[PDB]
Amino acid sequence: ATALATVQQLDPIYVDVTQSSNDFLRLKQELANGTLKQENGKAKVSLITS
């Protein structure tokens, strides 16, 4: 079970982001009601550091 060493790749990076469920569902309902608009495909994600 105990690992010997770790090898990591850093050129691309994953970011796992936490959303409250109620806000997610409310925004989904708003988008389904025609109040919101979507563009192309995957939405843009920006970062703010510490």
Binding site: S20, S21, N22, D23
Partner: protein
């Protein structure tokens, strides 16, 4: 904090007064430049009687 809490609005008094142990409110004001204070007091008593 948004996963288990809600929010709403209400109406409340920002200043509660009490006189001699009972809830009360106060009106403060002077009299006319050309009349006595006592006559104004009597008329205010008559108005409060209504």
């Amino acid at each position: 904090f948004s996963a288990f809490s809600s929010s709403r609005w209400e109406y409340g008094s920002p200043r509660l007064e009490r006189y001699n142990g009972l809830p009360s409110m106060e009106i403060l004001g002077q009299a006319a430049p050309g009349k006595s204070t006592g006559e104004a007091m009597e008329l205010m008593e008559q108005l409060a009687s209504k």
